[PDB]
Design a protein around this ligand. Structure first.
Ligand SMILES: NC(=O)C1=CN([C@@H]2O[C@H](COP(=O)(O)OP(=O)(O)OC[C@H]3O[C@@H](n4cnc5c(N)ncnc54)[C@H](OP(=O)(O)O)[C@@H]3O)[C@@H](O)[C@H]2O)C=CC1
Ligand SMILES: NC(=O)C1=CN([C@@H]2O[C@H](COP(=O)(O)OP(=O)(O)OC[C@H]3O[C@@H](n4cnc5c(N)ncnc54)[C@H](OP(=O)(O)O)[C@@H]3O)[C@@H](O)[C@H]2O)C=CC1
Ligand SMILES: OC[C@@H](O)[C@@H](O)[C@H](O)[C@@H](O)CO
Ligand SMILES: OC[C@@H](O)[C@@H](O)[C@H](O)[C@@H](O)CO
Ligand SMILES: OC[C@@H](O)[C@@H](O)[C@H](O)[C@@H](O)CO
Ligand SMILES: OC[C@@H](O)[C@@H](O)[C@H](O)[C@@H](O)CO
Ligand SMILES: OC[C@@H](O)[C@@H](O)[C@H](O)[C@@H](O)CO
Ligand SMILES: OC[C@@H](O)[C@@H](O)[C@H](O)[C@@H](O)CO
Lengths: 335, 336
């Protein structure tokens, strides 16, 4: 039994990463395409055997309500378009998978959650790392007490962004700079490794406004989190260096992954009793992308809630607003 | 090769286990005298290292060292609150001074030490041995040569799981503070020598369980953020409840990291420059970091040059440390 996905926004992530991974799914299938580029509907429609009756533009998208082969709409557009396409998908009676970051603001996330609730449809955010073997192993080591109580999480995410004209460097479409796009991985990991929500936030921003890339959004914004248990996080978010890693540490030892949240190539190292050494995670039956897709399908089929629902996305946006505020006001912001 | 004579003062762990055995590889330095509050230590190490009784001093007879021309330098290796009084007395006795980190408990103390050595016309150096360590020298060189491009981030963590609750490091009066004074200072010092800059803004967060037998008086964790004039940033960890020793410095062209970074031995460097991350071996150094540190002061004295890690370097760390404690206390960005 497989639920049908409509993929909306046929860009790099949709076409290079997500659509090929339906091949390993057990409860999900590609059923429809939604695009603002007629040429893409033809190319990918022909490639994946999607009939013309199942190809939509953004103008005809609302007609998808009459297509019973579509159960889920997966929104993979620029960030500022997540809310209106999610709302339209909910009004078309479809369940929704929405890419991170959920939306530009807390208020926008709340609107999305309300729309899906009103429709009685499920909502999930594309935090694929929660289905990735090494990440699952790090969470397990923490929960099983192998580190003792978490004391520090040190995590850095960044890449050297290029073309100044791309939507990520356009405030109207991206909603912000590095923190919205890649810094969110540091924040999301701080939260799922501690299993807590932060109560205090520091931040420092640093952007060269003479750089042609950074006229509108931020380059570096680094932040500190304090959690109720006393756990702490030091996080890097950057558009001008390459990094992808975290280490979580307690009095009994530590575990790190570098790269941590990449598409592939994860490598884990741990210091648990003895000297630092590589550590293999427990095997997972499916890659992180197929696992994410099937998780939503399986939740709908069994009447359960996604482990990374709209509330997880909303909680990230709450802290993101606090981080921007702490950097603007130069003070510790309380949550 | 002329060798200047060292008087080692405060015969504790670092003095006896780490420093004194490393005079063997020195080329311009020799062990000439001992200063201790424990008579047994003066006998044991006096006999082991062939130091005549005429060159053994207590804290009571230390000032007499002014009359001993075999002693050029006094190396102060006591608890932190005693760095200033012994530095002052050494300067008064006409000796140059090597002083362990942290320089002293406060900025005011550091300034007084600098003034006292200035008045005596003698040189002052702080024991930042990492500046003489092969992998650290290599990271600095990569930055200075432009291999990374402009420095954008420094991420550095220093900590160890401290044990005995009764030791002087957990006593506020003797240590001046908790993890930041002892081990977090390596994160700070590295952020400064990797960027080559001084911070203009500081954030910090403290996390300490005061009901822990170890942490009634001093802090466990205090993490901090630094902003530099170039736009460079640093994220730093200081801890007494986890083990970490590392840094990565990154720019648009690539990055280099060392883990462990500032340990006695065992350093390993990895870099992402012309390709994917791979091991990198640093340029070899003639002597180990300890012997190199000892010889640096001696050579400075012999040639009339200033130490690369003089009193001003220790003072600049204490200025930022004061700002870090303030930032954590007040919950705000502190401007420097
Ligand atoms: N979870 C992960 O690991 C990743 C998540 N993402 C997320 O996926 C989303 C898309 O990122 P990515 O796929 O890299 O971006 P791309 O620019 O590669 O694709 C964006 C697509 O969105 C559609 N779109 C609709 N309106 C616009 C517009 N005004 N300007 C540009 N594109 C528009 C287009 O599809 P059409 O031509 O079909 O209309 C376009 O190709 C973002 O939210 C990003 O955060 C991205 C990469 C990895
Ligand atoms: N650069 C580095 O890598 C390191 C630097 N250090 C620095 O060296 C200094 C000493 O550290 P460490 O050697 O580990 O400390 P220890 O406690 O092992 O030795 C301290 C010594 O100072 C003397 N002393 C004088 N007054 C007192 C007092 N009131 N209470 C205790 N001891 C006293 C004693 O020597 P006696 O019995 O001869 O009087 C004692 O043995 C500190 O400033 C520390 O930061 C320490 C370790 C590593
Ligand atoms: O088109 C949406 C439809 O309502 C379907 O997805 C139901 O949720 C069904 O329960 C599938 O299991
Ligand atoms: O890692 C996926 C991330 O969600 C994506 O949005 C970034 O832009 C990409 O990593 C660029 O490297
Ligand atoms: O497929 C590789 C595997 O996922 C990874 O864990 C490595 O085996 C480990 O990093 C040792 O190289
Ligand atoms: O947004 C919260 C959650 O992710 C979502 O699945 C709701 O529980 C559902 O919309 C209720 O009908
Ligand atoms: O060399 C590290 C630091 O300088 C030292 O003071 C530490 O506390 C010691 O390693 C443990 O006591
Ligand atoms: O403290 C600054 C420096 O370390 C010191 O060596 C002075 O330059 C010297 O005391 C002047 O005589």
């Amino acid at each position: 039994r497989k639920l049908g996905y409509a993929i909306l926004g046929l860009g790099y992530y949709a076409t290079r990463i997500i659509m090929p991974r339906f091949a390993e799914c057990e409860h999900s299938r590609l059923a429809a395409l939604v695009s603002g580029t007629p040429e893409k509907l033809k190319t990918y429609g022909e490639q994946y055997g999607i009939p013309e009756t199942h190809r939509y533009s953004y103008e005809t998208f609302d007609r998808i309500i009459d297509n019973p082969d579509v159960d889920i709409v997966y929104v993979i557009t620029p960030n500022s378009l997540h809310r209106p396409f999610t709302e339209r998908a909910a009004r078309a009676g479809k369940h929704v998978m929405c890419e991170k970051p959920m939306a530009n603001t807390v208020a926008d996330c709340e609107a999305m959650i309300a729309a899906c609730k009103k429709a009685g449809r499920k909502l999930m955010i594309g935090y694929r790392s929660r289905f990735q073997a090494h990440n699952i192993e790090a969470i397990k080591l923490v929960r099983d007490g192998a580190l003792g109580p978490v004391r520090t999480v040190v995590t850095d995410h960044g890449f050297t962004i290029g073309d100044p004209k791309q939507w990520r460097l356009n405030r109207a479409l991206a909603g912000g700079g590095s923190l919205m796009d890649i810094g969110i991985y540091s924040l999301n990991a701080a939260r799922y490794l501690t299993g807590e929500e932060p109560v205090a936030v520091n931040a420092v921003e640093s952007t060269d406004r003479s750089d042609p890339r950074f006229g509108e959004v931020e380059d570096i914004i680094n932040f500190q989190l304090l959690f109720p248990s006393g756990a702490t996080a030091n996080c890097v978010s950057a558009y001008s260096v390459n990094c992808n890693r975290y280490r979580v540490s307690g009095p009994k030892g530590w575990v790190e992954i570098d790269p941590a949240t990449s598409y592939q190539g994860q490598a884990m190292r741990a210091q648990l009793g003895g000297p630092p050494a590589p550590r293999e995670p427990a095997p997972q039956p499916k890659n992180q992308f197929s696992a994410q897709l099937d998780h939503l399908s399986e939740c709908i089929l069994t009447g359960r809630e996604p482990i990374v629902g709209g509330d997880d996305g909303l909680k990230d946006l709450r802290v993101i607003e606090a981080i921007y505020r702490a950097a603007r006001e130069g003070r510790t912001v309380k949550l």
